[PDB]
Amino acid sequence: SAGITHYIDAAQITIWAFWLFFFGLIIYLRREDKREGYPLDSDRTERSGGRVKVVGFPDLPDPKTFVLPHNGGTVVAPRVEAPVAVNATPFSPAPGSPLVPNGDPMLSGFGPAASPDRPKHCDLTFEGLPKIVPMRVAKEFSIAEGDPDPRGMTVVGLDGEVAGTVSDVWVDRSEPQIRYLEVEVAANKKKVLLPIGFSRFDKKARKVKVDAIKAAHFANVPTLSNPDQVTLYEEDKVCAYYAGGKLYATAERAGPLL
Amino acid sequence: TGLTDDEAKEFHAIFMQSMYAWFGLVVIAHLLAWLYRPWL
Amino acid sequence: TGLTDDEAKEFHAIFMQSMYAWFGLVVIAHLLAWLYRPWL
Amino acid sequence: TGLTDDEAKEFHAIFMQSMYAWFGLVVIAHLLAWLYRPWL
Amino acid sequence: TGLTDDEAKEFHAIFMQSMYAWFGLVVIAHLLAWLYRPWL
Amino acid sequence: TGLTDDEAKEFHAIFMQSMYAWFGLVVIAHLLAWLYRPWL
Amino acid sequence: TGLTDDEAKEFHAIFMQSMYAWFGLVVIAHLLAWLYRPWL
Amino acid sequence: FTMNANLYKIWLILDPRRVLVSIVAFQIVLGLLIHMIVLSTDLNWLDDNIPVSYQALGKK
Amino acid sequence: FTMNANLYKIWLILDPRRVLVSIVAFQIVLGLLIHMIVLSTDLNWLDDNIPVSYQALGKK
Amino acid sequence: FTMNANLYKIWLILDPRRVLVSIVAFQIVLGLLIHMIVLSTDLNWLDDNIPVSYQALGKK
Amino acid sequence: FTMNANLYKIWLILDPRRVLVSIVAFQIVLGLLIHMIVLSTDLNWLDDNIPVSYQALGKK
Amino acid sequence: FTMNANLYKIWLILDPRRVLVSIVAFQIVLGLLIHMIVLSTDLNWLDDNIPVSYQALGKK
Amino acid sequence: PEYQNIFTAVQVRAPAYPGVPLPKGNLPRIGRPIFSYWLGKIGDAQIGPIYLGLTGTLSIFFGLVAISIIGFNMLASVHWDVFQFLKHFFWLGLEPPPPQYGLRIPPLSEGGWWLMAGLFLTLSILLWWVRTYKRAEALGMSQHLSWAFAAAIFFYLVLGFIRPVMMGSWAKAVPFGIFPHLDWTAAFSIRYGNLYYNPFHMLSIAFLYGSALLFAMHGATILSVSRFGGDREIDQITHRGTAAERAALFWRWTMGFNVTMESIHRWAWWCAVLTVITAGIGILLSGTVVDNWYLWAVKHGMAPAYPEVVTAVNPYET
Amino acid sequence: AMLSFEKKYRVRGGTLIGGDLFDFWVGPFYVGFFGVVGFCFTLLGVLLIVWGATIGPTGPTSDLQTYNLWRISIAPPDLSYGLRMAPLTEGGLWQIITICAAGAFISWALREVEICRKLGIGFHVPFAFSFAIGAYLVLVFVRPLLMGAWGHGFPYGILSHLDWVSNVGYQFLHFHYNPAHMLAISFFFTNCLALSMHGSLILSVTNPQKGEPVKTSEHENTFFRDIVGYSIGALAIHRLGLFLALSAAFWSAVCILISGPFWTRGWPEWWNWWLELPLW
Ligand code: BCL
Ligand code: BCL
Ligand code: BCL
Ligand code: BCL
Ligand code: BCL
Ligand code: BCL
Ligand SMILES: CC[C@H]1c2cc3[nH]c4c(c3C)C(=O)[C@H](C(=O)OC)c4c3nc(cc4[nH]c(cc(n2)[C@@H]1C)c(C(C)=O)c4C)[C@@H](C)[C@@H]3CCC(=O)OC/C=C(\C)CCC[C@H](C)CCC[C@H](C)CCCC(C)C
Ligand SMILES: CC[C@H]1c2cc3[nH]c4c(c3C)C(=O)[C@H](C(=O)OC)c4c3nc(cc4[nH]c(cc(n2)[C@@H]1C)c(C(C)=O)c4C)[C@@H](C)[C@@H]3CCC(=O)OC/C=C(\C)CCC[C@H](C)CCC[C@H](C)CCCC(C)C
Ligand SMILES: COC1=C(OC)C(=O)C(C/C=C(\C)CC/C=C(\C)CC/C=C(\C)CC/C=C(\C)CC/C=C(\C)CC/C=C(\C)CC/C=C(\C)CCC=C(C)C)=C(C)C1=O
Ligand SMILES: COC(C)(C)C/C=C/C(C)=C/C=C/C(C)=C/C=C/C(C)=C/C=C\C=C(C)\C=C\C=C(C)\C=C\C=C(C)\C=C\CC(C)(C)OC
Ligand SMILES: [Ba+2]
Ligand SMILES: [Ba+2]
Ligand SMILES: [Ba+2]
Ligand SMILES: [Ba+2]
Ligand SMILES: [Ba+2]
Ligand SMILES: [Fe+3]
């Protein structure tokens, strides 16, 4: 007998090998997925007083330490984060219900206006100088030949009212680019940051539109504990406020439509 | 890691007998298997 | 590797006979296999 | 290179011996192979 | 290149000897190769 | 190229002699080659 | 070109003789080629 | 005189919870695996027609 | 059993945990590979009809 | 001179851990490679059917 | 002395570590390469049936 | 080696480390290239049966 | 309305940056920078400087040699009529040694140029590999690229070198031409019984679709959180921000689970490396192990049956 | 259940449609009006694919009927039905299932939209999704329409749709020569390259050799500039990758849109316009 066809050939067993390595892979990636946001929040944990920490399958991976350059620290993941109150109240006491923000929605710091507490220190260049700084601090930087200089354009909110005018431009010392617009606010002549991501240009007009917030809201932009640099904490606090206007800045972004 | 030396002597003891029990059930199954259906 | 010079004699000592034990089990199963079914 | 001048004599002492040991295993297996089936 | 003139003579010498040893092994292999199996 | 006039005498000197030695080796290989198996 | 007016004279001098040398070596190789193997 | 005598200390180096769960998992998988491997070969115990053919409630 | 003697110092260089797990993985894999190798050659012991053909315990 | 005499100093130059592990890898891979090389040529030792064939070892 | 009477100086300009390890890699590849070259010519030593064809010995 | 000008000054113009690297690389390329071209032409010196035939000294 | 972060609408310059400093041994850097207002319209406007070591130069060298053999051969094939070369270029190519030669080094005029271009190309590719590892070490970083490049090199080697040698025939490697190499692909599938029923090529296709899905999703995400400096993935990875939070949550509310700013890059990495790794496996088995994938799939009961509404009697059987 | 930083964002509102009606969560999925519609479209769709597997092409007792995962297939009606609704058991089922799939995808997209509105993030994801939805529509709606019949759509079956792709492709002799096809393939490939490069970079910097600290933006740029003399930069690579993937889908949609309706001959022949220019 020189013909006993074997039913299992190298392709079968190699597809088997694949699937096994695959399963181990999937599991592993799902473990890296829980280095943040975990263990979850249920009323299972609170009902049980905590004896039910929510983690699911697979489980959480041993902490990993990131050693920040420049006397920066040591970060871990997963870590234990202190709970933080919610600046809102349950739309329903029933589970899975959303919460309505407490007070003036843009002030709430809840919803599209929420944000975490990032360090109260600055991101740094390789050298260790504040990465994000204004062009006034970053002497060297310069507009690109043929690009309207933002400096001096008018910042205008979502309803067409002037907000202020661009008093300067913040830039990345690590990856040369416009990160922030500075706004000398009209209504109180105080200085605020405006993320580039929220700013639209109107070059022929030398304007800088903002669908995000209303001209007035520019008055409440979170502020810098120092005008020649900004902290990680402050970047989040700045952007999130503007983000809030996306759902709050009008009594209509709230939805529905019909 | 984080057991005293006494509880990994203990753990090793209980583990060892437990595993050997599994080896037992398996050897059981393999003998029945050899009986009903020789493969060699 | 954050070990003392004495506690890798230890690791080495246990490791080596265990490894060798494995090699033993192997040589056994291989002899059993060679008796039942030589490949050369 | 995170070693001291004495630990590159010492390491080296150990390396030389380990490598010659391995090569020993090698020349052994190859002579056996030449015995069963010469290839040259 | 962070070396002093003494650690480039030291290096050059040791290197030369090592390189020559390897080359020695080379002509060795070439003689074995040439006797049983001439190629030119 | 950050050199002074004297390290362009020295480098050029050592360079020149080494290249001439190499050209020598080449002329050698070409002569051995020409003797054993003419292509012209 | 970060050079002085006299150091484009010197460069040119050295360049010119070096170049006539290359074109010359070339005319030589070309005659060498033409006697032994006419192409026209 | 030998040395396999401090082979408990393994639970000072490799997490027991993990080694256990690892083993439990590894075995369940190996079981399903081998079962399928035999099932694709001659030693199959499903499609053998043993001991009373069920597709033979008639002329089969 | 080194065999003699300061080749313990080898665990002064290469992490015991890492070396162990490395061997575990390496062997756990290699075993499967050669198992497979054996399955495709003369030493195959399953789809051999050894010692009696089982898909000839009925028909299929 | 065939004799080195200051070639301990190499570990003053090359990280011992890395060179070691490097050798481990290079050897294990090379072993795998040439093994396969031998398996694919005349000098093959598995599918030889020597000294008695197992694939035509049964009348059944 | 008519010869590179200052040819240590090369290691004052070119990093000894890189050059060494680079050298090792270069030779290992060239070995691999030339071996492969020989294997592709008449001078091949494997698919040769030396000293006897194994794909035609065996009982059987 | 007969005088030429001030053709040392080239190293006030061309960086020595880099020309070194250029020559090493270029020459290595050219060496393998021509070697293979010749290996690919009639002037082959390997696959010639020289001086004793190797493919019909063992397939025999 | 709101900026989409597609086009830098207003750019800024600073003196070019020659970069972080490499230790001794990593040679100087060459060339001096320039800025392209248009690249700048969409990305870092800086063009270079570049690093070129022994490795890099020896690779540029081999690679250009290989490109020359392929090209010169193509001009030769249309008779040095560069017009014709221009006309049929898409169809021009350098075919491989013919099978009559097996794995022997063939004459110039019959494929030897292909073997030389194949030789030099591979060497130049693997040298570019080493290059990227060196370039990756001088910066203290890890070898993630090098492990992926090593995967793509794996597939390449599987295509033109490993399978041919295993199959004992340089003619089985792929030929250098645009349309010619398209034909090699199609002929390849036809010869081995429809590559669609080859599981490995299905997975590799799942992984290619997946590299498109993942980069599309992640990229869309990161731009959508580009208002929170989400592109600055490094610090969102060390000091999680509302960018990485809004990002992970968008997906959480849509499909029920999510990853993190660091982990999505692991899903992406592994999925790309997977294309090339299933792909090479797929070619490895073609002809060496399986000869007719449609058949293989039938043997494992995966191939569908349709009502046989159209059919043809086999003349070989009359 | 929520992430450990999620409650602070679970705001009310943002719908397009529904308002507080379906404005709630279930586990980790957000519901919303389009989720309810979506779940309906999806469930009925799948449940019908289940009935098709149950009945088979010739009836539940036939040998062609099957529950084997690789072979179950629901195919469109014959061309004879043109754009009419065809009987359920003659490709009708496939039509309905299609309506459900299209509706589920469009619902899904709109739900990601309500979700962007909630979180205050850009709408890049559902826009990008809409390219796959577009691709799906040419493959089931546009093309078969331009071709006077829904039967030109691909069947819903794991390998049968592979067979579909195969024979439709081969009707043009050598599809590889389709120029839009060549484009789309290049984008799928390039996408695969950028993805592998970005992945590698981030993982190579946020996790460096032991003994080194988290790397920097300066490292990032210095590396790809070292290797290939250019670094498109962090932001932009997220921009490019999105370009590559969306374009890959685009050119796939156009590469198949032109195969029939705008080109009936074999595809290599298309390239004739190039061999016949008055330059040669
Ligand atoms: C191939 C020829 C024979 C065959 C021969 C064998 C042989 C030989 C063996 C089996 C064995 C197994 N067979 Mg069988 N078997 C056959 C046909 C079948 C069929 C079927 C549909 O026909 C089935 C369902 C099974 C089922 C199984 C599994 C139940 C079992 C292995 C368990 C395992 O791997 O999990 C993984 C196992 C473990 C992790 C250890 C078991 C412990 C359990 C799972 C508990 C885990 C601990 C958990 C944490 C709970 C804690 C415990 C509390 C503290 C008390 N066999 C065929 C006919 N079968 C094996 C066995 O042992 O069972 C007899 C075995 O050796
Ligand atoms: C028996 C039929 C198959 C076989 C099937 C398996 C299976 C199944 C397994 C192994 C496993 C192992 N096999 Mg095996 N193996 C065989 C042929 C060989 C040969 C050989 C020269 O032919 C060798 C060296 C090996 C080696 C080994 C080890 C590599 C490995 C387990 C221990 C280990 O890794 O540590 C190294 C161990 C050693 C160096 C000792 C070498 C092992 C024995 C002594 C070698 C037997 C051949 C030897 C020359 C003596 C032959 C007898 C004389 C001819 C009379 N096998 C034959 C071809 N082999 C196990 C494994 O890989 O996972 C751990 C496993 O599960
Ligand atoms: C026709 C050809 C012959 C053949 C001829 C040879 C020849 C000739 C040789 C081998 C050798 C090998 N063969 Mg064989 N071999 C064949 C058939 C087989 C079969 C089979 C299935 O039939 C198997 C499994 C093997 C298996 C093996 C491998 C186990 C082994 C090479 C190991 C290696 O790569 O280095 C990797 C291994 C190591 C680097 C050592 C592992 C050390 C461990 C991990 C460290 C322990 C800790 C230590 C105490 C302290 C730390 C030290 C440092 C880590 C170093 N052979 C056929 C029959 N085989 C080689 C050998 O004998 O060994 C060199 C060899 O020379
Ligand atoms: C086709 C006709 C002849 C042939 C004619 C020649 C001729 C003619 C020459 C060579 C040369 C070389 N040949 Mg040969 N050669 C033949 C067959 C072979 C075979 C073989 C397996 O059959 C091999 C392995 C070689 C190998 C070699 C290399 C060792 C050597 C240098 C060139 C080089 O490495 O390129 C790339 C590397 C370089 C160019 C080096 C550049 C670096 C610096 C400048 C030089 C130092 C390098 C190194 C230290 C020198 C080592 C060799 C010394 C002579 C001892 N030849 C065929 C049979 N060969 C050359 C030589 O011998 O050296 C002069 C040469 O001129
Ligand atoms: C044509 C008939 C078959 C077909 C036959 C094949 C064949 C045959 C193959 C594929 C291959 C692939 N096919 Mg297919 N394929 C078909 C239908 C499809 C369909 C579809 C919608 O129907 C899809 C999506 C695919 C998709 C795919 C990819 C997933 C896969 C490999 C991708 C890749 O990038 O590797 C490409 C990446 C590389 C090769 C690595 C690149 C790295 C190198 C080193 C770069 C060097 C650059 C160079 C040095 C720069 C200098 C340039 C010089 C000029 C050279 N195929 C039809 C059914 N397909 C592969 C496969 O699956 O095999 C199992 C393959 O080889
Ligand atoms: C068979 C002979 C021809 C061939 C004929 C065809 C034909 C015919 C076609 C392709 C198609 C394509 N081919 Mg082809 N192709 C060939 C060779 C190749 C090769 C190669 C290596 O040679 C490659 C790489 C490709 C690759 C490509 C891609 C460019 C393209 C498909 C992209 C796509 O579908 O996007 C679109 C993505 C989608 C439509 C998915 C949309 C997602 C929807 C909205 C959501 C689905 C959700 C669903 C429910 C998910 C289930 C999840 C569960 C619920 C949990 N082909 C051979 C030569 N090729 C197709 C094309 O051109 O583009 C359409 C096409 O029609
Ligand atoms: C998951 C696998 C995916 C992938 C990954 C991948 N590709 C990679 C890598 C990785 C990880 C690299 O590390 C490497 C890279 O460098 O990335 C930018 C690369 C690579 N992928 C590339 C191509 C590539 N990869 C592909 C595929 C894939 N790669 C998969 C999608 C494809 C396909 C099939 O479409 C292609 C075409 C290259 C850009 C690069 C490898 C380049 C290389 O090997 O270089 C060899 C040598 C040369 C090309 C010679 C250089 C030619 C110069 C342009 C000439 C310059 C002349 C100069 C002015 C000097 C003057 C000349 C002197 C002689 C006078
Ligand atoms: C356009 C660029 C790439 C892209 C983009 C893209 N896709 C996306 C997104 C984006 C940006 C999402 O945000 C969205 C998502 O949720 O992320 C996972 C999605 C999506 N990408 C997915 C699939 C997908 N995308 C693909 C491709 C592409 N999508 C391109 C490569 C592909 C392919 C074929 O390569 C697939 C398979 C989904 C997981 C998800 C959208 C899922 C969804 O909307 O769920 C609602 C619908 C259901 C749950 C099922 C409805 C039930 C139906 C009634 C039955 C289905 C019948 C079907 C037609 C039969 C097909 C049978 C098959 C066997 C052939
Ligand atoms: C961490 O961050 C990172 C960096 O930052 C530091 C990096 O620098 C880097 C280095 C990155 C790089 C060097 C980028 C490398 C990119 C490569 C190699 C890609 C190759 C691309 C090319 C050669 C150019 C190809 C494209 C063209 C020529 C343009 C052609 C135009 C065509 C065909 C017509 C356009 C029209 C269409 C396509 C039709 C419709 C399309 C759409 C609707 C798409 C929509 C797109 C968007 C973006 C919204 C990485 C990897 C990184 O991860
Ligand atoms: C007029 O033109 C001038 C400028 C001269 C130059 C022009 C050049 C041009 C325009 C060239 C154009 C080239 C093109 C377009 C090439 C396209 C090539 C394509 C599309 C190729 C596609 C696939 C090719 C593959 C996968 C090739 C694989 C080949 C391999 C893997 C070969 C391996 C060979 C090896 C490793 C050799 C080993 C040799 C040994 C050592 C074994 O010999 C003993
Ligand atoms: Ba049976
Ligand atoms: Ba044999
Ligand atoms: Ba047998
Ligand atoms: Ba021979
Ligand atoms: Ba004409
Ligand atoms: Fe990213």
JSON list of C-alpha atoms in Angstrom, two decimals, chain J:
[
{"chain": "J", "resi": 1, "resn": "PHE", "atom": "CA", "xyz": [51.85, 33.68, 16.77]},
{"chain": "J", "resi": 2, "resn": "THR", "atom": "CA", "xyz": [48.56, 31.75, 16.87]},
{"chain": "J", "resi": 3, "resn": "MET", "atom": "CA", "xyz": [48.01, 32.77, 20.49]},
{"chain": "J", "resi": 4, "resn": "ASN", "atom": "CA", "xyz": [45.61, 35.61, 21.49]},
{"chain": "J", "resi": 5, "resn": "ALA", "atom": "CA", "xyz": [46.78, 36.55, 25.03]},
{"chain": "J", "resi": 6, "resn": "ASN", "atom": "CA", "xyz": [44.54, 39.61, 25.60]},
{"chain": "J", "resi": 7, "resn": "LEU", "atom": "CA", "xyz": [41.32, 38.35, 24.16]},
{"chain": "J", "resi": 8, "resn": "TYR", "atom": "CA", "xyz": [39.62, 38.41, 27.49]},
{"chain": "J", "resi": 9, "resn": "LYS", "atom": "CA", "xyz": [39.40, 42.15, 26.87]},
{"chain": "J", "resi": 10, "resn": "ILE", "atom": "CA", "xyz": [36.68, 41.49, 24.26]},
{"chain": "J", "resi": 11, "resn": "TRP", "atom": "CA", "xyz": [34.11, 41.57, 27.08]},
{"chain": "J", "resi": 12, "resn": "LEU", "atom": "CA", "xyz": [35.43, 45.02, 27.82]},
{"chain": "J", "resi": 13, "resn": "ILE", "atom": "CA", "xyz": [34.06, 45.74, 24.37]},
{"chain": "J", "resi": 14, "resn": "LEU", "atom": "CA", "xyz": [30.98, 43.55, 23.75]},
{"chain": "J", "resi": 15, "resn": "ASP", "atom": "CA", "xyz": [28.02, 43.26, 26.15]},
{"chain": "J", "resi": 16, "resn": "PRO", "atom": "CA", "xyz": [28.29, 39.65, 27.41]},
{"chain": "J", "resi": 17, "resn": "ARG", "atom": "CA", "xyz": [24.54, 39.23, 28.00]},
{"chain": "J", "resi": 18, "resn": "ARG", "atom": "CA", "xyz": [23.72, 40.27, 24.45]},
{"chain": "J", "resi": 19, "resn": "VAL", "atom": "CA", "xyz": [26.53, 38.34, 22.78]},
{"chain": "J", "resi": 20, "resn": "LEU", "atom": "CA", "xyz": [25.45, 35.26, 24.75]},
{"chain": "J", "resi": 21, "resn": "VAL", "atom": "CA", "xyz": [21.80, 35.44, 23.85]},
{"chain": "J", "resi": 22, "resn": "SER", "atom": "CA", "xyz": [22.86, 36.33, 20.29]},
{"chain": "J", "resi": 23, "resn": "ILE", "atom": "CA", "xyz": [24.74, 33.08, 20.06]},
{"chain": "J", "resi": 24, "resn": "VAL", "atom": "CA", "xyz": [21.70, 31.20, 21.51]},
{"chain": "J", "resi": 25, "resn": "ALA", "atom": "CA", "xyz": [19.48, 32.58, 18.80]},
{"chain": "J", "resi": 26, "resn": "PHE", "atom": "CA", "xyz": [21.94, 32.23, 15.91]},
{"chain": "J", "resi": 27, "resn": "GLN", "atom": "CA", "xyz": [22.66, 28.62, 16.85]},
{"chain": "J", "resi": 28, "resn": "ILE", "atom": "CA", "xyz": [19.06, 27.55, 17.35]},
{"chain": "J", "resi": 29, "resn": "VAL", "atom": "CA", "xyz": [17.99, 29.13, 14.04]},
{"chain": "J", "resi": 30, "resn": "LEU", "atom": "CA", "xyz": [20.98, 27.67, 12.13]},
{"chain": "J", "resi": 31, "resn": "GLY", "atom": "CA", "xyz": [20.17, 24.27, 13.61]},
{"chain": "J", "resi": 32, "resn": "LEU", "atom": "CA", "xyz": [16.60, 24.57, 12.37]},
{"chain": "J", "resi": 33, "resn": "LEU", "atom": "CA", "xyz": [17.77, 25.74, 8.90]},
{"chain": "J", "resi": 34, "resn": "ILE", "atom": "CA", "xyz": [20.41, 23.17, 8.09]},
{"chain": "J", "resi": 35, "resn": "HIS", "atom": "CA", "xyz": [18.22, 20.45, 9.62]},
{"chain": "J", "resi": 36, "resn": "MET", "atom": "CA", "xyz": [15.67, 21.36, 7.00]},
{"chain": "J", "resi": 37, "resn": "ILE", "atom": "CA", "xyz": [18.44, 21.48, 4.38]},
{"chain": "J", "resi": 38, "resn": "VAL", "atom": "CA", "xyz": [19.44, 17.92, 5.17]},
{"chain": "J", "resi": 39, "resn": "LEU", "atom": "CA", "xyz": [15.81, 16.83, 5.27]},
{"chain": "J", "resi": 40, "resn": "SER", "atom": "CA", "xyz": [15.38, 18.08, 1.67]},
{"chain": "J", "resi": 41, "resn": "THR", "atom": "CA", "xyz": [18.35, 16.29, 0.15]},
{"chain": "J", "resi": 42, "resn": "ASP", "atom": "CA", "xyz": [19.72, 12.83, -0.56]},
{"chain": "J", "resi": 43, "resn": "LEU", "atom": "CA", "xyz": [21.07, 12.58, 2.94]},
{"chain": "J", "resi": 44, "resn": "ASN", "atom": "CA", "xyz": [17.52, 12.63, 4.36]},
{"chain": "J", "resi": 45, "resn": "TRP", "atom": "CA", "xyz": [16.97, 10.15, 7.21]},
{"chain": "J", "resi": 46, "resn": "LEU", "atom": "CA", "xyz": [13.19, 9.96, 7.81]},
{"chain": "J", "resi": 47, "resn": "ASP", "atom": "CA", "xyz": [11.33, 9.01, 4.65]},
{"chain": "J", "resi": 48, "resn": "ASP", "atom": "CA", "xyz": [13.89, 6.31, 3.81]},
{"chain": "J", "resi": 49, "resn": "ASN", "atom": "CA", "xyz": [11.88, 3.23, 4.74]},
{"chain": "J", "resi": 50, "resn": "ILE", "atom": "CA", "xyz": [15.07, 1.77, 6.30]},
{"chain": "J", "resi": 51, "resn": "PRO", "atom": "CA", "xyz": [15.46, -0.91, 7.49]},
{"chain": "J", "resi": 52, "resn": "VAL", "atom": "CA", "xyz": [11.78, -1.81, 7.13]},
{"chain": "J", "resi": 53, "resn": "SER", "atom": "CA", "xyz": [8.96, 0.22, 5.60]},
{"chain": "J", "resi": 54, "resn": "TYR", "atom": "CA", "xyz": [6.05, 1.22, 7.85]},
{"chain": "J", "resi": 55, "resn": "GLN", "atom": "CA", "xyz": [3.80, 2.70, 5.11]},
{"chain": "J", "resi": 56, "resn": "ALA", "atom": "CA", "xyz": [3.55, -0.71, 3.36]},
{"chain": "J", "resi": 57, "resn": "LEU", "atom": "CA", "xyz": [3.89, -2.54, 6.68]},
{"chain": "J", "resi": 58, "resn": "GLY", "atom": "CA", "xyz": [0.32, -3.93, 6.60]},
{"chain": "J", "resi": 59, "resn": "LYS", "atom": "CA", "xyz": [-1.98, -6.06, 4.46]},
{"chain": "J", "resi": 60, "resn": "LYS", "atom": "CA", "xyz": [-5.14, -4.20, 5.47]}
]
